[PDB]
Amino acid sequence: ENFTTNLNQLARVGGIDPLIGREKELERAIQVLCRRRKNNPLLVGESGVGKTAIAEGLAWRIVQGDVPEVMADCTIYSLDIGSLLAGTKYRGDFEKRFKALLKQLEQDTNSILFIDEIHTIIGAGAAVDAANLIKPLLSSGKIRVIGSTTYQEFSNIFEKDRALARRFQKIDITEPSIEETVQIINGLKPKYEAHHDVRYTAKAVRAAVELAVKYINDRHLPDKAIDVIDEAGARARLMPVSKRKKTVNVADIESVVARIARIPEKSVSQSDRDTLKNLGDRLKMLVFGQDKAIEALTEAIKMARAGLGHEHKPVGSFLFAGPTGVGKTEVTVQLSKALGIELLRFDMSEYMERHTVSRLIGAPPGYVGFDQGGLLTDAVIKHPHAVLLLDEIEKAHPDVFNILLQVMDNGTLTDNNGRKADFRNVVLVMTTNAGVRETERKSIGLIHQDNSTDAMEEIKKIFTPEFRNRLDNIIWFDHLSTDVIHQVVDKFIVELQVQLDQKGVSLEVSQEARNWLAEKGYDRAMGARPMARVIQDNLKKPLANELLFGSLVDGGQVTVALDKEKNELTYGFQS
Amino acid sequence: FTTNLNQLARVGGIDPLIGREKELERAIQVLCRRRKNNPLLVGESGVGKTAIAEGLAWRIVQGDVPEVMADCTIYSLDIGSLLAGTKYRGDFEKRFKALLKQLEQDTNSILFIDEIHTIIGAGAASGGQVDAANLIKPLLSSGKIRVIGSTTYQEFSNIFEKDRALARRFQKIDITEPSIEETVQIINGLKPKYEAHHDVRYTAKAVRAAVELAVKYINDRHLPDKAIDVIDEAGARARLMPVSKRKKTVNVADIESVVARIARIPEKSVSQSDRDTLKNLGDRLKMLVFGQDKAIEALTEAIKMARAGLGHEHKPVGSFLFAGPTGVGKTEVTVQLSKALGIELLRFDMSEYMERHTVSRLIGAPPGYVGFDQGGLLTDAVIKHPHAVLLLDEIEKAHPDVFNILLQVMDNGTLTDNNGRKADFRNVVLVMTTNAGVRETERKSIGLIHQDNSTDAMEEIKKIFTPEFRNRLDNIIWFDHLSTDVIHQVVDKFIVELQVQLDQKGVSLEVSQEARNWLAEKGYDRAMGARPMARVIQDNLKKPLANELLFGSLVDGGQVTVALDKEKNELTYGFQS
Ligand SMILES: Nc1ncnc2c1ncn2[C@@H]1O[C@H](COP(=O)(O)OP(=O)(O)OP(O)(O)=S)[C@@H](O)[C@H]1O
Ligand SMILES: Nc1ncnc2c1ncn2[C@@H]1O[C@H](COP(=O)(O)OP(=O)(O)OP(O)(O)=S)[C@@H](O)[C@H]1O
Ligand SMILES: Nc1ncnc2c1ncn2[C@@H]1O[C@H](COP(=O)(O)OP(=O)(O)O)[C@@H](O)[C@H]1O
Ligand SMILES: Nc1ncnc2c1ncn2[C@@H]1O[C@H](COP(=O)(O)OP(=O)(O)O)[C@@H](O)[C@H]1O
Ligand SMILES: [Mg+2]
């Protein structure tokens, strides 16, 4: 009895919060507990769902007396695994303690042993135990045992074995709905408020549940809700030393979630109106190229968030096309950086093999637990509120395109694992380099002919006609201009200047050098991708060599220019 | 048994806490909570987590923290005294319970137990009737008692997985190494003890230098301990190293040589006079490798950037994917690179780790996580030698899972072992050799006159290697086929190899200049690289010499002359003995 703690006695003295909800799940446990055989119940639920608390609720019902007379005199106990494994150091010493407790429980009838995290004690698992004594107590039917096990590790421990599954009844314990969860907070509000004497507004508690699931995406919302609430209350209790701000507002809860999320407060805060209003301004600040596309794309985002009365379909389905590395990927990453979401990257070129298609929605080789599962489907579940970047969509197998249609139309994807993804919030973007390839090729003729083709016709050849109708608007990048590329060179050198600033050496670049580096580095076929290679090997190699051994060890004071006749850069350094 | 930290601060025994404001504010907030009111400080050995519990009490007397946290006296338990003190039977229950009574009935009672893992169960051998962890859990569940934890990163995982209930009650707190500015400030508080005990005086430049010198060279130890370890050793050095000088002052020179011995690096390396090392590095490779001048330029320039510091500091010094034909010395140049640098080279074969089952071994231990300490083979190598050349032969053959791991190294240059210490590639040069370019265009173009049919360069490798991996790479060093003129230089070094072998047997070999030309042309094969030179030398020079060394005049050793007659275009050898 020393190892275990009587929950029934605990309720009499208090300290158990009144359970709210889960009336059907709680009633189910009592029904199975009254069975002649297989009375032992199981609670298959994820961490934070509230599977441990529902068992506590049963003890409260017994003390309250709102149960049949059979269970009115019954008692419940909670097995402490830590107490049993405290200092034994040998497997089998633990078992002796378990046997002694079973005899103590067996003498008195109407005793229930609530084994929390039953999966740990039974089964070999992955990351110890014997599991020899759990089987006889189940087959003997003397004392009922309530076992809480997660969905994961239950299929590999209970379904694999007949003895444990046969004596245990499975109770699906799903996460509560948003409406149900906010009601629970109201039930628990008097206990938390009494601790620090602060009053919570209805808006803040409702916002906490809604925002927590959207941003945290780590554990289930019931546990997350109580954490942010208690954290905000504790923070509010001691945040101002001089001022006792007994009142609470949405401002306080926003900062608390930002700290654990480690994301800027502005993004975490429910400032969707503010962020959407300045979405273009923030994006345009860092990147000043392709303003025409930004204006069309920025407006498409604001209207997309509204949904036009249709929300089941994915909010974002914009497709981008044009020359490679001319801003197709910069806008996507900068869009995520401004929003603060975690950008995901997948190259369809890599997934151009039928075996690779299976990798996206599962694992061809045998895996244990299917933890890796699909390369993309699992990532979507990990971060549903994040943008999905696809590269070289043109070079993909035909079957892959069929799967894409289901995402935009059906709004959900089913794979071998069976996990569901809420594509409503999910956004999608793609980049197509096929269009630039068509203009690069030369016709089979004595005199070449204009290869410029309408962007719409090019897509029809490589993409099915059943996709452009479901899309919002097509954005195409034709080519950069001299004024845009020239300005970009100035921005890129700043990174080198910032890098040199910490080292303690200054740098000076002539305007003529900047103009010359732009024409060579920029390529129509390859966009701005070779510009980084051209500019880096040109500037980095001479400066790096001199900086180590030479006059530029300390001081800097460099000068760069190019002779007109030579048309080649010249580097000057001052000690 | 227990010592009041709050009162110790008034006496002044504990040094005043500085910095770590972010950690402290987080701790008071979680402790303030109704539930989950037990902060757990998780870190590593030397991070300074122990000084936060003692440092926290110091702030209470000062009054900087909120009034609610004020008026709370923090006590500290003793792991050894409590267990050792209860030699008699049944004393532990009354003693631990009597001690609990002091904290009980007091809303402001606070308690700290360093190394919380030690008290998972304690003071009982025969039975588990009373447990240190579970004796305080029922009362703690009601919130009467609030405690503070302090455990290591790896050890925290054991309690977290084994006991989910305890994990809920304890709120994990991430601890990080203190800033360079904070480190020097902390050493000033400790400096009186070390300087007084050793009868030495530490200069302001010496203490500051140790912080940057140790992190640069010492690897396994952590920065607070690293700075304090060298300071203790540095003072001791003054007493014992100089017999007659008996210097009582610790200078930067006195506190930098110790870091060299502690790190087992060459003396004067802390001086950072690496300009000469990089000046002749390029020539050193060309002298032993002929025909890859282009690779040396691109390869040397990149290493120069990293040593010069022109680049992402987190990113490793270099990322390279050696590729080309067989026998072009892609592996040889890599080995010679380490020798010229004078840095130990760690070679790893990816063929053994071709499949996922063996990929574990490289990054972690097998299912017996605690059974085998080796864990990840790559991490301990870097930990043992943070400055090293890592060779990965036949990288393409490996499973794509390893490629995913390499992306992280290029992104931030960090890797974490499942059961071991942390490792970083900031000071490690990544070089992996692939055989994607070994394809040979054996077939020739149809027609009376052959035409150049060269496979497109770097296009095929795109399919073999993952696309995202290629984008992160700095440069790909392709190895061109050996030129005919280059062959002559390769032959010359093979004679030196043959010569040293012959010297052991007492034979001296003289080879004419025309002899080298014949061997070079006969054995020229671009498809087989330089390897045929060893075969033609083995076939034309070693074979006849072997017969004479065992069955002829060379049993005792002597002069040998090699030449070829123009009339027959065949080599003729002359033995003198
Ligand atoms: N009706 C309710 N439904 C769910 N949770 C509730 C409810 N009422 C209160 N809670 C609280 O919500 C939290 C639920 O935690 P649980 O999901 O039971 O934890 P757990 O799954 O046992 O955690 P582990 O040990 O980490 S798997 C506790 O703080 C409960 O007291
Ligand atoms: N450029 C070179 N200079 C000197 N020796 C060379 C050169 N290239 C190859 N060798 C010789 O080739 C042998 C080493 O071959 P490796 O460098 O291991 O082959 P590799 O270039 O990695 O190609 P494979 O496909 O792995 S055989 C030694 O005998 C070297 O001396
Ligand atoms: N508007 C722009 N302003 C500045 N740089 C740009 C702009 N658009 C594209 N770039 C540059 O184009 C390059 C794209 O590189 P990368 O991401 O490898 O291209 P890709 O995704 O086509 O393979 C980066 O250097 C990026 O900064
Ligand atoms: N004000 C301070 N802030 C942080 N650390 C400090 C401070 N004062 C001293 N220290 C250092 O804190 C360290 C505590 O080490 P500790 O956490 O006990 O190590 P371990 O985790 O290996 O047991 C000591 O090295 C001590 O010098
Ligand atoms: Mg090789």
Coordinates of C-alpha atoms in Angstrom, one line a residue, chain B residues 60-493:
Chain B
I60 CA 16.5 37.2 -2.6
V61 CA 18.4 39.0 0.1
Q62 CA 19.3 41.8 -2.4
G63 CA 15.6 42.2 -3.2
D64 CA 16.0 42.5 -7.0
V65 CA 13.3 39.8 -7.6
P66 CA 9.6 40.3 -7.0
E67 CA 8.3 40.7 -3.5
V68 CA 6.4 37.4 -3.8
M69 CA 9.7 35.5 -4.4
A70 CA 11.1 37.5 -1.5
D71 CA 10.8 36.2 2.1
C72 CA 11.4 32.6 0.9
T73 CA 14.4 30.8 2.4
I74 CA 16.0 28.2 0.1
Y75 CA 17.4 25.0 1.7
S76 CA 19.8 22.5 0.1
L77 CA 19.7 18.8 0.8
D78 CA 22.8 16.6 1.1
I79 CA 23.0 13.3 -0.7
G80 CA 25.8 11.8 1.3
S81 CA 25.1 13.1 4.8
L82 CA 21.5 12.0 4.8
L83 CA 22.3 8.4 3.7
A84 CA 25.5 8.2 5.8
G85 CA 23.9 9.8 8.9
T86 CA 21.2 7.2 9.2
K87 CA 23.5 4.3 10.2
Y88 CA 21.0 3.1 12.8
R89 CA 17.8 1.3 11.8
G90 CA 14.7 3.4 11.2
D91 CA 16.4 6.8 11.6
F92 CA 15.9 7.8 7.9
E93 CA 12.1 7.9 8.1
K94 CA 11.9 10.1 11.2
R95 CA 14.9 12.2 10.1
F96 CA 13.6 12.8 6.5
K97 CA 10.1 13.3 7.8
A98 CA 11.2 15.6 10.6
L99 CA 13.1 17.7 8.1
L100 CA 10.0 17.8 5.9
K101 CA 8.0 19.2 8.8
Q102 CA 10.2 22.3 8.7
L103 CA 9.2 23.0 5.0
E104 CA 5.7 21.8 5.6
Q105 CA 3.1 24.3 6.9
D106 CA 5.1 27.2 5.3
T107 CA 3.9 28.6 2.1
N108 CA 7.3 30.1 1.3
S109 CA 9.3 26.9 1.9
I110 CA 11.8 26.2 -1.0
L111 CA 14.1 23.2 -1.5
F112 CA 16.9 22.4 -3.9
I113 CA 18.3 18.9 -4.6
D114 CA 21.3 19.0 -7.0
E115 CA 21.6 15.8 -9.0
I116 CA 17.9 14.9 -8.7
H117 CA 18.7 11.6 -10.4
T118 CA 20.5 10.5 -7.3
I119 CA 17.2 10.6 -5.3
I120 CA 15.0 8.5 -7.6
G121 CA 15.3 6.0 -4.8
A122 CA 17.7 6.1 -1.9
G123 CA 18.4 4.9 1.7
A124 CA 16.8 1.5 1.3
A125 CA 18.4 -1.8 0.2
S126 CA 16.2 -4.7 1.3
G127 CA 12.9 -3.1 0.6
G128 CA 11.2 -0.2 -1.3
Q129 CA 8.9 0.6 1.6
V130 CA 10.2 4.2 1.7
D131 CA 11.7 6.0 -1.3
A132 CA 13.4 9.5 -1.4
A133 CA 11.6 10.4 -4.6
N134 CA 8.2 9.0 -3.6
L135 CA 8.3 10.2 0.1
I136 CA 8.0 13.8 -1.1
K137 CA 5.6 13.1 -4.0
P138 CA 2.2 12.8 -2.3
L139 CA 2.7 16.1 -0.4
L140 CA 4.3 17.7 -3.4
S141 CA 1.3 16.7 -5.5
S142 CA -0.9 18.8 -3.2
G143 CA 1.6 21.7 -3.8
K144 CA 2.8 22.0 -0.2
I145 CA 6.4 21.3 -1.2
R146 CA 8.1 22.8 -4.3
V147 CA 11.6 21.6 -5.3
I148 CA 14.2 22.5 -7.9
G149 CA 16.1 20.0 -10.1
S150 CA 19.5 19.8 -11.6
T151 CA 20.5 17.0 -14.0
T152 CA 22.5 16.4 -17.2
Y153 CA 21.0 16.4 -20.7
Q154 CA 21.5 12.7 -21.3
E155 CA 20.5 11.5 -17.8
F156 CA 17.3 13.6 -18.0
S157 CA 16.0 11.3 -20.8
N158 CA 16.2 8.3 -18.5
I159 CA 13.8 9.7 -15.8
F160 CA 11.6 11.4 -18.4
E161 CA 10.9 8.1 -20.4
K162 CA 10.7 5.8 -17.4
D163 CA 8.4 8.0 -15.3
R164 CA 6.0 10.1 -17.3
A165 CA 4.2 11.2 -14.1
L166 CA 7.4 12.8 -12.7
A167 CA 8.0 14.5 -16.1
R168 CA 4.6 16.3 -15.8
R169 CA 5.4 17.6 -12.3
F170 CA 8.8 18.9 -13.4
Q171 CA 9.1 21.7 -15.9
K172 CA 12.3 21.3 -18.0
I173 CA 14.4 24.4 -18.4
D174 CA 17.1 24.6 -21.1
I175 CA 20.5 25.9 -19.9
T176 CA 23.2 27.2 -22.2
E177 CA 26.9 28.1 -21.9
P178 CA 27.5 31.6 -20.5
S179 CA 28.6 34.4 -22.9
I180 CA 32.3 35.2 -23.2
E181 CA 31.7 38.5 -21.3
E182 CA 29.9 36.7 -18.5
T183 CA 32.6 34.0 -18.2
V184 CA 35.4 36.5 -17.5
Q185 CA 33.2 38.3 -14.9
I186 CA 32.5 35.0 -13.1
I187 CA 36.2 34.1 -13.0
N188 CA 36.9 37.4 -11.1
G189 CA 34.7 36.2 -8.2
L190 CA 36.5 32.8 -8.1
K191 CA 40.0 34.3 -8.8
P192 CA 40.7 35.3 -5.2
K193 CA 40.7 31.7 -4.0
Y194 CA 43.0 30.3 -6.8
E195 CA 45.4 33.3 -6.6
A196 CA 45.5 33.2 -2.8
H197 CA 46.1 29.4 -2.6
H198 CA 48.9 29.4 -5.2
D199 CA 50.5 32.7 -4.0
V200 CA 50.2 34.1 -7.5
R201 CA 48.6 37.1 -9.2
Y202 CA 46.5 36.8 -12.4
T203 CA 46.6 39.7 -14.9
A204 CA 43.5 41.0 -16.6
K205 CA 44.8 39.8 -20.0
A206 CA 45.5 36.3 -18.7
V207 CA 42.0 35.6 -17.5
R208 CA 40.5 37.0 -20.7
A209 CA 42.9 35.1 -22.9
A210 CA 42.1 31.7 -21.3
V211 CA 38.4 32.0 -22.2
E212 CA 39.1 32.4 -25.9
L213 CA 42.2 30.1 -26.0
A214 CA 40.5 27.1 -24.3
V215 CA 37.3 27.2 -26.4
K216 CA 39.4 27.3 -29.5
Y217 CA 41.6 24.3 -28.6
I218 CA 40.0 22.4 -25.6
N219 CA 37.0 20.6 -27.0
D220 CA 35.4 18.1 -24.5
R221 CA 35.3 20.4 -21.5
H222 CA 32.7 23.2 -21.2
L223 CA 33.5 26.9 -21.1
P224 CA 33.0 27.6 -17.4
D225 CA 35.0 24.6 -16.4
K226 CA 37.5 25.2 -19.2
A227 CA 38.3 28.7 -18.0
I228 CA 38.5 27.5 -14.4
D229 CA 40.6 24.4 -15.1
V230 CA 43.3 26.3 -17.0
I231 CA 43.3 29.0 -14.3
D232 CA 43.9 26.4 -11.6
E233 CA 46.6 24.6 -13.6
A234 CA 48.2 28.0 -14.6
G235 CA 48.7 29.1 -11.0
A236 CA 50.2 25.7 -10.1
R237 CA 52.6 25.9 -13.0
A238 CA 54.1 29.1 -11.5
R239 CA 54.9 27.3 -8.2
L240 CA 56.5 24.2 -9.8
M241 CA 57.7 24.9 -13.3
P242 CA 60.2 27.7 -12.5
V243 CA 62.7 26.4 -9.9
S244 CA 64.8 29.6 -9.7
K245 CA 62.7 32.4 -11.3
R246 CA 59.7 31.6 -8.9
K247 CA 57.5 34.0 -10.8
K248 CA 54.4 35.2 -9.0
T249 CA 52.6 36.7 -12.0
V250 CA 50.5 34.9 -14.6
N251 CA 50.8 36.4 -18.1
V252 CA 49.1 35.5 -21.3
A253 CA 52.3 33.5 -22.2
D254 CA 52.0 31.6 -18.9
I255 CA 48.3 30.9 -19.4
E256 CA 48.5 29.9 -23.1
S257 CA 51.2 27.2 -23.0
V258 CA 49.1 25.2 -20.5
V259 CA 46.2 25.1 -23.1
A260 CA 48.6 23.6 -25.6
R261 CA 49.5 20.7 -23.3
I262 CA 45.9 20.2 -22.1
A263 CA 44.8 20.0 -25.8
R264 CA 48.0 18.0 -26.7
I265 CA 48.8 20.3 -29.6
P266 CA 52.2 21.6 -30.8
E267 CA 53.7 24.3 -28.7
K268 CA 53.3 27.9 -30.1
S269 CA 50.2 26.7 -32.0
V270 CA 48.2 29.1 -29.8
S271 CA 50.3 31.9 -31.4
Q272 CA 48.2 31.2 -34.6
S273 CA 51.1 31.6 -36.9
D274 CA 49.4 29.6 -39.7
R275 CA 50.4 31.9 -42.6
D276 CA 53.4 29.8 -43.4
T277 CA 51.4 26.5 -43.1
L278 CA 49.0 27.7 -45.9
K279 CA 51.7 29.4 -48.0
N280 CA 53.4 26.1 -49.0
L281 CA 50.3 23.9 -48.6
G282 CA 49.4 24.2 -52.3
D283 CA 53.0 23.4 -53.5
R284 CA 53.2 20.4 -51.1
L285 CA 50.3 18.7 -52.8
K286 CA 51.5 19.4 -56.4
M287 CA 55.0 18.1 -55.5
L288 CA 53.4 14.7 -54.7
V289 CA 50.4 14.9 -57.0
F290 CA 50.8 15.5 -60.7
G291 CA 48.0 16.4 -63.1
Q292 CA 45.4 17.9 -60.6
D293 CA 46.7 21.5 -60.5
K294 CA 43.2 22.7 -61.0
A295 CA 41.9 20.8 -58.0
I296 CA 44.6 22.3 -55.7
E297 CA 43.7 25.8 -56.7
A298 CA 40.0 25.4 -56.0
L299 CA 40.6 23.2 -52.9
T300 CA 43.3 25.3 -51.3
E301 CA 41.4 28.6 -51.9
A302 CA 38.4 27.3 -50.1
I303 CA 40.4 26.1 -47.1
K304 CA 42.1 29.5 -47.1
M305 CA 38.7 31.2 -46.8
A306 CA 37.8 29.2 -43.8
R307 CA 41.1 29.7 -42.0
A308 CA 40.9 33.4 -42.9
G309 CA 37.3 33.4 -41.6
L310 CA 35.6 34.7 -44.7
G311 CA 32.4 32.7 -44.5
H312 CA 29.7 31.3 -42.3
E313 CA 31.4 30.4 -39.0
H314 CA 28.8 27.8 -38.1
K315 CA 29.2 26.2 -41.6
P316 CA 32.2 23.8 -41.7
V317 CA 35.5 24.9 -43.1
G318 CA 34.8 23.1 -46.4
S319 CA 32.4 20.8 -48.2
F320 CA 33.7 18.8 -51.2
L321 CA 32.6 15.9 -53.3
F322 CA 35.7 14.5 -55.0
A323 CA 34.7 13.0 -58.4
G324 CA 36.4 11.7 -61.5
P325 CA 38.1 8.7 -63.0
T326 CA 39.8 5.9 -61.2
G327 CA 43.5 6.2 -60.5
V328 CA 43.6 10.1 -60.8
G329 CA 44.6 10.3 -57.1
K330 CA 41.4 11.7 -55.7
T331 CA 42.0 9.6 -52.6
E332 CA 45.7 10.1 -52.6
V333 CA 45.5 13.9 -52.7
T334 CA 43.1 13.8 -49.8
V335 CA 45.6 11.7 -47.7
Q336 CA 48.5 13.9 -48.6
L337 CA 46.5 17.0 -47.7
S338 CA 46.2 15.8 -44.1
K339 CA 50.0 15.0 -44.0
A340 CA 51.0 18.5 -45.3
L341 CA 48.6 20.1 -42.8
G342 CA 50.1 17.8 -40.1
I343 CA 46.6 16.9 -38.9
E344 CA 45.5 13.4 -38.1
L345 CA 43.2 12.0 -40.8
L346 CA 40.1 9.9 -40.0
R347 CA 39.1 7.7 -42.9
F348 CA 35.6 6.1 -43.0
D349 CA 34.4 3.7 -45.7
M350 CA 30.7 4.1 -46.6
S351 CA 30.5 0.6 -48.1
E352 CA 30.2 -0.9 -44.6
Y353 CA 27.3 1.5 -43.9
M354 CA 25.7 0.9 -47.2
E355 CA 22.3 0.0 -45.7
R356 CA 20.0 1.6 -43.1
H357 CA 20.7 -1.1 -40.5
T358 CA 24.4 -0.2 -40.3
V359 CA 23.7 3.6 -40.6
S360 CA 22.8 3.5 -36.9
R361 CA 26.4 2.6 -35.9
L362 CA 27.6 5.8 -37.5
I363 CA 25.2 8.1 -35.6
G364 CA 24.2 6.0 -32.6
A365 CA 24.2 2.8 -30.7
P366 CA 22.2 -0.4 -31.5
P367 CA 19.0 -1.3 -29.6
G368 CA 21.3 -1.9 -26.6
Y369 CA 21.6 1.9 -26.2
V370 CA 23.5 1.7 -22.9
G371 CA 25.2 -1.6 -23.6
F372 CA 27.6 -0.1 -26.2
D373 CA 29.2 3.2 -25.3
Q374 CA 30.6 3.6 -28.9
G375 CA 27.3 4.9 -30.2
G376 CA 27.9 7.0 -33.3
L377 CA 31.4 6.3 -34.8
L378 CA 31.5 9.7 -36.6
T379 CA 30.8 11.8 -33.5
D380 CA 33.5 10.4 -31.2
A381 CA 36.1 10.9 -34.0
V382 CA 35.2 14.6 -34.3
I383 CA 35.1 14.9 -30.5
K384 CA 38.5 13.3 -30.2
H385 CA 40.0 15.3 -33.1
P386 CA 37.9 18.5 -33.8
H387 CA 40.6 19.5 -36.3
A388 CA 40.6 16.6 -38.7
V389 CA 40.2 15.5 -42.4
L390 CA 37.2 13.2 -42.7
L391 CA 37.3 10.9 -45.7
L392 CA 34.1 9.2 -46.9
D393 CA 34.9 6.8 -49.7
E394 CA 32.1 5.4 -52.0
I395 CA 29.6 7.9 -50.6
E396 CA 27.1 7.2 -53.5
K397 CA 26.8 3.6 -52.6
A398 CA 25.4 4.5 -49.2
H399 CA 21.7 4.7 -48.5
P400 CA 20.0 8.1 -49.1
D401 CA 19.4 8.4 -45.3
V402 CA 23.0 9.4 -44.7
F403 CA 22.6 12.2 -47.3
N404 CA 19.9 13.7 -45.0
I405 CA 22.4 13.8 -42.1
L406 CA 24.9 15.6 -44.3
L407 CA 22.4 18.5 -45.0
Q408 CA 22.5 19.4 -41.3
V409 CA 26.3 19.6 -41.2
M410 CA 26.3 22.1 -44.1
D411 CA 23.4 24.1 -42.6
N412 CA 24.8 24.5 -39.0
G413 CA 27.7 22.0 -38.7
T414 CA 26.2 20.3 -35.6
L415 CA 25.2 16.7 -34.8
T416 CA 23.9 15.2 -31.5
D417 CA 24.6 11.6 -30.5
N418 CA 21.6 9.6 -29.2
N419 CA 23.7 8.4 -26.2
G420 CA 26.9 10.4 -26.4
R421 CA 28.4 13.9 -26.4
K422 CA 27.8 16.7 -28.9
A423 CA 30.0 17.2 -31.9
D424 CA 30.6 20.1 -34.4
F425 CA 32.1 20.3 -37.8
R426 CA 33.1 24.0 -37.7
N427 CA 36.8 22.9 -37.5
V428 CA 36.4 19.8 -39.7
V429 CA 36.8 19.7 -43.5
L430 CA 34.3 17.4 -45.1
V431 CA 35.6 15.5 -48.2
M432 CA 33.8 12.6 -49.7
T433 CA 35.0 10.7 -52.8
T434 CA 32.4 9.4 -55.3
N435 CA 32.8 7.2 -58.4
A436 CA 30.1 8.7 -60.5
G437 CA 32.6 9.9 -63.1
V438 CA 34.3 6.5 -63.6
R439 CA 32.2 6.0 -66.8
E440 CA 34.4 5.5 -69.9
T441 CA 33.3 6.1 -73.4
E442 CA 34.7 2.8 -74.7
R443 CA 32.6 3.0 -77.9
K444 CA 33.8 5.3 -80.6
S445 CA 31.8 7.4 -83.1
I446 CA 30.8 5.6 -86.3
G447 CA 32.7 7.0 -89.3
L448 CA 36.0 6.9 -91.1
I449 CA 37.3 9.7 -88.8
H450 CA 36.6 9.6 -85.1
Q451 CA 34.9 12.6 -83.5
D452 CA 35.0 13.8 -79.9
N453 CA 32.2 12.2 -77.9
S454 CA 32.5 13.5 -74.3
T455 CA 29.8 12.8 -71.8
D456 CA 28.2 15.9 -70.4
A457 CA 30.0 17.0 -67.2
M458 CA 28.0 17.0 -64.0
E459 CA 24.7 16.1 -65.6
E460 CA 24.7 12.4 -64.7
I461 CA 25.8 13.1 -61.0
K462 CA 22.5 15.1 -60.6
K463 CA 20.5 11.9 -60.9
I464 CA 22.8 9.9 -58.7
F465 CA 23.0 12.4 -55.8
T466 CA 20.0 14.1 -54.1
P467 CA 19.3 17.6 -55.6
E468 CA 19.1 19.5 -52.3
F469 CA 22.4 18.1 -51.2
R470 CA 24.2 19.4 -54.3
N471 CA 22.9 23.0 -53.8
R472 CA 24.4 23.2 -50.3
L473 CA 27.9 22.1 -51.5
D474 CA 30.4 24.9 -51.9
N475 CA 32.3 23.4 -54.8
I476 CA 32.7 20.0 -56.6
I477 CA 36.3 19.1 -57.4
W478 CA 36.3 17.1 -60.6
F479 CA 39.5 15.3 -61.4
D480 CA 40.6 15.4 -65.0
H481 CA 42.2 12.4 -66.8
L482 CA 45.9 12.2 -66.4
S483 CA 47.8 13.9 -69.3
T484 CA 50.5 12.1 -71.2
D485 CA 53.2 14.6 -70.1
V486 CA 52.1 14.0 -66.5
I487 CA 52.7 10.3 -66.8
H488 CA 56.5 11.0 -66.9
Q489 CA 56.4 12.7 -63.5
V490 CA 54.4 9.7 -62.0
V491 CA 57.0 7.2 -63.3
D492 CA 59.8 9.2 -61.5
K493 CA 58.2 8.8 -58.1

